[PDB]
Design a protein around this ligand. Structure first.
Ligand code: MG
Ligand code: MG
Ligand code: MG
Ligand code: MG
Ligand code: MG
Ligand code: MG
Ligand code: MG
Ligand code: MG
Ligand code: MG
Ligand code: MG
Ligand code: MG
Ligand code: MG
Ligand code: MG
Ligand code: MG
Ligand code: MG
Ligand code: MG
Ligand code: MG
Ligand code: MG
Lengths: 206, 141, 61, 63, 56, 145, 56, 69, 107, 141
RNA sequence: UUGCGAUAACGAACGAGACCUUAACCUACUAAAUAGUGGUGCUAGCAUUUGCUGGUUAUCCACUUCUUAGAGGGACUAUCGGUUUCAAGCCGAUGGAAGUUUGAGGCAAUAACAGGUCUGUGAUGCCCUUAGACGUUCUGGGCCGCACGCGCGCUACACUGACGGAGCCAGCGAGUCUAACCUUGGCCGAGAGGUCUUGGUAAUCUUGUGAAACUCCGUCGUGCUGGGGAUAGAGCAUUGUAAUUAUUGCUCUUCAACGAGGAAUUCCUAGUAAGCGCAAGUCAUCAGCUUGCGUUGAUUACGUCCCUGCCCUUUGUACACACC
């Protein structure tokens, strides 16, 4: 709880992160308590990290990607559509800017908001093609909690990538608007709109 | 407490060191500025255009400081980039070799680099002193 | 993907037949005394033989 | 909509035409040991907690 | 003789492969089975594995 | 080495060198509307004419327009280094001319009908409407040209 | 060919080898080509011991 | 379409309405005032010097700014 | 002719490592019994000569390739040798398949 | 002479050699402090060996790291390994073992690559594709 | 067809596997100025009071962590739980450099196909020609010719982006006197390139291949726009006996479609896809190509027979040049 002097001097804001590990230096991984269970053990909080870059292996087993942190899994769903393949330095830079904007409006915890997004745009009832042809029937299945996390990260980040495309608004703030709208539940986010499309199909495909 | 030019960030050093030689003004900026692009792989000339030769010389003299010898050909390969060949894919093209040779001959006459019998330019007695002063300035400004 | 060939399992079973009051439930000494009581042409071959043989004792107890 | 969280007891096997549907046996968290069998689209595992928008329907596709 | 080791080893591998086919053709009816070239200073000696040596 | 402000004493769409050069866009990118004057040529002459490059081309004073065009029509006077132009060592008088707005079509025709008139093969390919720079016509250009 | 191949196969076996195989392909008074293996003994076809033990 | 010069009547609601903005950026001034990004950038650097907005990030390609107090 | 160090280096280049390190061992064993000081077998990086050809002689089939590899292994041993007795015991039994060069220097 | 250990850290091709010896808090990378690393968003990878245990465990120690090979992210993950391995190897040879095994607890309980080199290696490209697995597009028509 | 098990079979052989190569570990050995590190024999600088340096191995000494490559060791799913017929196995956890055949290749049986190659060979039978030649050689043209259909690609439709500056980091090769190869440095030139020298037959020199995406700071600001660079004009170089139908590069100008793509269709399960570029091959010159190589590095599943293809068993047969 003290400042330390070294021959190569360390700044004080990083020296204050000695007492708690936060996102990048700013937002704690504590009080990110998830109001909806069944996604706990699949939203990966309760292990703090500093930056959302980790070269960790999580795709060599069936469920190791449930232990990749939920901010790294959000950065992961950004760096695609070819021209952005590779480039996690750009995707981590976005989420640093994104969690700023999530903190500025609706001034609460920006990690809690992206967690509130994943628990809100996870598709709880989906459908599958029963019958092995084009002229078939569709059946209402329940959805795995890993898939509800898997699709929610996909639905939010696609709706960020679409809305930031071809306009002045940045990927930093479209995603921030995507996650804030999804945190409330508003039908003005892409991911909530796409989720209720999946769920109204399964009401009728029972 | 004795500051070298490694304790200061390279972006913040070169901006400070370029504005020093600009406000001092003895660098003999060669005359063909605003007609040159700094590389064949470039589309445009430098976008600041009253400047950029103070910045190129600040980056060269820093690069001489870090290294032990740098010549012109190593300097062109340094500042080259991806050349858009239009419809064929990109490539590395070395930078302009008359700009960087007239950077080095400029820093010689103001005493920063010299002839260095293992190649091209090593940084001088005085040039090491000159960059080290600015490095002392930059941490506490 | 870890099923063992007959040449591992015959040589393991032929070791148990005539060297039970010898080599024990430890792989490491089983690895090392197959150097003396068997002529095995490869280090990778010896360790698979010594490991199934170790697996066999743990079943025998 | 009165949803119910249910707790996986057994992964009874894959079903569906392509194998992408896994049939599981769950017990409800509220009023526990009220055990039924459901279909799951994503990767389901033992002791996963998953949510049902209906309380009276058992999975019918198998083998 | 001022030639690289990547080149001097390949050129000796070509001088071997040329005499292999030359002695295949010339010593065909005398039971040639192989040639063995030993690169020594001041002489190289060509060892011919011919089964009926007495007419070679 | 710092950022300074500005103010908008502004003039819209403006004829220049027989081209409706636009306002609301910057000086070296409003003068790319003029044929024969591209980006490198705009950037060199908007520095030779002592014009601030951030002026948005409609805050430009009407005498600053006149120095811009006087440099364009006459570049070898004002130390543009004669490798920077369209037509150099021209075809008939050997002198370097930067060809401008309506004249770049005119000298294009003058090049193409010089070339047919000697029955040169590139002029013949120019007459037939084929590609003239040694392409492969078998696959490409197969909805137009 | 059957007298030549079994002549050299059973010369190899009587000279002390583990395996031998003679394969003759071509045409012999018939237009359509056929191949017949004259194999006696024991061969190993896969792996490094092809390089260790087999003369081809 | 987007004002690339700055006359007075845009100036007196740049200085009146960037107060009550929670989030201010280049694109925030583009889509809610009606200037271009090259004047939104100028209206960012000017307005932090006047101190009615305070910086948070100050990255190139993305500036996060917010209302003072 | 009287026991003077000559600062000789024997470089040994060969495709096959077992025959190469046979002579590089014997150069060590010869100079450890004349009590000569030596920098030992310095193992230079293996030159790998790779040649990629299409498998087929014509142009038919799937696009299948070989990589034919020649490995060159090389060593050198530095010596400081009384020349007449050491040149007597080095020029004898030159190894085929191993190329050996002997260089003296004035340092 | 001085109590000194020398370790290394390794990503794909980036090998950071650390020369850890007794001193006064010095933490340097290739000539330069830990405060300026480039990429400046990956600054906290090379602060995780410092912050997980506290700065006070580095106050008696000089660390002088040379990294070459690899790339910009890849060198960063070798820096955080070279000095987390350098501090532990200093707490093996000189400081107590119970104090060494708190270092190896909190390093491993956060990030296993802080001490143990990741074995993911470049799988070779195969003919018939631009990739190791990926194949050229086939036609049928 | 890997085994376990059932068993009129028992016990084996080829193939699979083992094997060989490559990659990941070795602070354990053997060392090295053709690799480094540490002092400093010894200096010598800059700021200082030790931080960053530059220099000499009978004009030093020591060490091998880093690198190399000899010889070895390591992993055998080890250990422990769960399931299985307590099998063969499989899954999870812990340890571990590695727990996907450890990753990846090389090798790869029996049987074939009327698969391709006579235009790779002085591999070859038969046929054709053999001087007015289908031989050989010389000069010029052609393969590239353009209403068009198809295949693999390269460049994009932009703000997760272009430009300018700045930061600046790999790995696999190759290279000349058995003659003009890789080229550092200096000078001249916007550039392309030229000239004077140099080092290297190569862990020694090019070369730290200072590679590109990337990062930061500026300029742009949703406009077919500063995206895109197709077409086209003018000039300067290089290679070459020879550049015209532009060999290629360079500087200015022209700035086309293209606003993410019907029907359909390809590849792909972890350092893998994808983005990025570098070397080699052919090469005098020419890469949007291929073989590698490294940089950046995700989504999704650890399943199935639904589509397609293949395999095995049962049934049918009037088929055995075997549904051609
Ligand atoms: Mg040069
Ligand atoms: Mg070009
Ligand atoms: Mg099924
Ligand atoms: Mg046999
Ligand atoms: Mg076998
Ligand atoms: Mg095998
Ligand atoms: Mg790829
Ligand atoms: Mg070692
Ligand atoms: Mg055929
Ligand atoms: Mg046929
Ligand atoms: Mg002739
Ligand atoms: Mg052709
Ligand atoms: Mg094709
Ligand atoms: Mg850039
Ligand atoms: Mg390198
Ligand atoms: Mg345009
Ligand atoms: Mg050609
Ligand atoms: Mg090439």
């Amino acid at each position: 709880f003290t400042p330390v002097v070294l021959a190569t001097p360390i700044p004080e804001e990083v020296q204050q992160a000695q007492t708690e590990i936060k996102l990048f230096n700013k937002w704690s991984f504590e009080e990110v308590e998830v109001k909806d269970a069944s996604l706990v053990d699949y939203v990966q909080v309760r292990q703090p990290i500093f930056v959302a870059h980790t070269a960790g292996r999580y795709a060599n087993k069936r469920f190791r990607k449930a232990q990749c942190p939920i901010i790294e899994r959000l950065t992961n769903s950004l760096m695609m559509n070819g021209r952005n393949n590779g480039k996690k330095l750009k995707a981590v830079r976005i989420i640093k800017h994104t969690l700023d904007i999530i903190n500025v409006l609706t001034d609460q915890n920006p990690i809690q908001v992206v967690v509130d997004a994943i628990t809100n745009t996870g598709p709880r009832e989906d459908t599958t093609r029963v019958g092995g042809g084009g002229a078939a029937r569709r059946q209402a299945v329940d959805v795995s909690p890993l898939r509800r996390v898997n699709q929610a990260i996909a639905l939010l980040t696609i709706g960020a990538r679409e809305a930031a495309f071809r306009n002045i608004k940045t990927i930093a703030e479209t995603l921030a608007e995507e996650l804030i709208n999804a945190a409330k539940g508003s039908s003005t986010s892409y991911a909530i709109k796409k989720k209720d499309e999946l769920e109204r199909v399964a009401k009728s495909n029972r | 407490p004795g500051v070298s030019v490694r304790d200061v960030a390279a972006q913040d050093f070169i901006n400070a060191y370029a504005s020093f030689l600009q406000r001092q003004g003895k660098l003999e900026v060669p005359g063909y500025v605003d007609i040159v692009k700094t590389s064949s792989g470039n589309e445009m000339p430098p976008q600041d255009a009253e400047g950029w030769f103070y910045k190129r010389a600040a980056s060269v003299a820093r690069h001489i400081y870090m290294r032990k010898q740098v010549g012109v050909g190593k300097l062109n390969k340094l500042y080259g980039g991806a050349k858009s060949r239009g419809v064929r894919p990109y490539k590395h093209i070395d930078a302009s070799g008359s700009i960087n040779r007239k950077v080095l001959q400029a820093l010689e006459k103001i005493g920063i680099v010299e002839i260095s019998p293992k190649g091209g330019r090593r940084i001088s007695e005085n040039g090491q002193r000159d960059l080290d002063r600015i490095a002392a300035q930059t941490l506490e400004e | 993907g870890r099923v063992r060939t007959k040449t591992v399992k015959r040589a393991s079973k032929a070791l148990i037949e005539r060297y039970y009051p010898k080599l024990t439930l430890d792989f490491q000494t089983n690895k090392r005394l197959c150097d003396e009581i068997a002529t095995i042409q490869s280090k990778r071959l010896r360790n698979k033989i010594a490991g199934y043989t170790t697996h066999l004792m743990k079943r025998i107890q | 909509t009165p949803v119910t969280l249910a707790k996986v007891i057994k992964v009874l096997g894959r079903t569906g035409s392509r194998g992408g549907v896994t049939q599981v046996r769950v017990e409800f968290l509220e009023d526990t040991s009220r055990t039924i069998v459901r279909n799951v689209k994503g990767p389901v595992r033992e002791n996963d907690i998953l949510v049902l928008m209906e309380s009276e329907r058992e999975a019918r596709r198998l083998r | 003789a001022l030639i690289s080791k990547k080149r001097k080893l390949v050129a000796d591998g070509v001088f071997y492969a040329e005499l292999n086919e030359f002695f295949t053709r010339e010593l065909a009816e005398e039971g040639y089975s192989g040639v063995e070239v030993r690169v020594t200073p001041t002489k190289t000696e060509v060892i011919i594995r011919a089964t009926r040596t007495q007419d070679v | 080495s710092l950022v300074v402000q500005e103010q908008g004493s502004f003039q819209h769409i403006l004829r220049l060198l027989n081209t409706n050069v636009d306002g609301n866009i910057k000086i070296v990118y409003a003068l790319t509307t003029i044929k024969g004057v591209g980006r490198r040529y705009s950037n060199l002459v908007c520095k030779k004419a002592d014009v601030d490059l951030h002026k948005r081309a409609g805050e430009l004073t009407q005498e600053e327009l006149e120095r811009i065009v006087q440099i364009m029509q006459n570049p070898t006077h004002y130390k543009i280094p004669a490798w920077f132009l369209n037509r150099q060592n021209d075809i008939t008088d050997g002198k370097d001319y930067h060809t401008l707005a309506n004249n770049v079509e005119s000298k294009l025709r003058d090049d193409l009908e010089r070339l047919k008139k000697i029955r040169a093969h590139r002029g013949i390919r120019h007459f037939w409407g084929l590609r003239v720079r040694g392409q492969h016509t078998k696959t490409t250009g197969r909805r137009r040209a | 060919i059957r007298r030549a191949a079994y002549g050299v196969v059973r010369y190899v076996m009587e000279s002390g080898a583990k395996g031998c195989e003679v394969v003759v392909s071509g045409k012999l008074r018939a237009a359509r080509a056929k191949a017949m293996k004259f194999a006696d003994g024991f061969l190993i076809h896969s792996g490094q011991p092809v390089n260790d033990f087999i003369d081809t | 379409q987007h004002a690339v010069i700055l006359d007075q009547e845009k100036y007196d609601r740049i200085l009146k309405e960037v107060p009550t903005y929670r989030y201010v950026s280049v694109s925030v001034l583009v889509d809610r005032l009606k200037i271009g990004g090259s004047l939104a950038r100028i209206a960012l650097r000017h307005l932090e010097k006047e101190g009615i907005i305070k910086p948070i990030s100050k990255h190139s390609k993305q500036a996060i700014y917010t209302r003072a107090t | 002719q009287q026991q003077q160090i000559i600062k000789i280096r024997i470089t040994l280049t060969s495709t096959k490592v077992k025959q190469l390190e046979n002579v590089s061992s014997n150069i060590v064993k010869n100079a450890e019994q004349h009590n000569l000081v030596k920098k030992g077998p310095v193992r230079l990086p293996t030159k790998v000569l790779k040649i990629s050809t299409r498998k087929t002689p014509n142009g038919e089939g799937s696009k299948t390739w070989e990589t034919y590899e020649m490995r060159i292994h090389k060593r050198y041993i530095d010596l400081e040798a009384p020349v007449q007795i050491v040149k007597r015991i080095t020029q004898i039994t030159i190894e085929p398949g191993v190329d050996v060069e002997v260089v003296v220097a004035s340092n | 002479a001085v109590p000194s250990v020398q370790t290394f850290g390794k990503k794909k091709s980036a090998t950071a050699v650390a020369h850890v010896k007794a001193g006064k808090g010095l933490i340097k990378v290739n000539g330069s402090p830990i405060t300026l690393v480039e990429p400046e968003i990956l600054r906290f990878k090379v602060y995780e060996p410092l912050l997980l245990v506290g700065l006070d465990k580095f106050s008696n120690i000089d660390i002088r790291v040379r990294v070459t090979g690899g790339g910009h992210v890849s060198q960063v993950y070798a820096i955080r390994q070279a000095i987390a391995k350098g501090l532990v190897a200093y707490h093996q040879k000189y400081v107590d073992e119970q104090s060494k095994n708190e270092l190896k607890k909190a390093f491993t309980s956060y990030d296993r690559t802080l001490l143990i080199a990741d074995s993911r290696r470049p799988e070779p490209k195969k003919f018939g594709g631009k990739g190791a697995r990926s194949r050229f597009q086939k036609s049928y028509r």
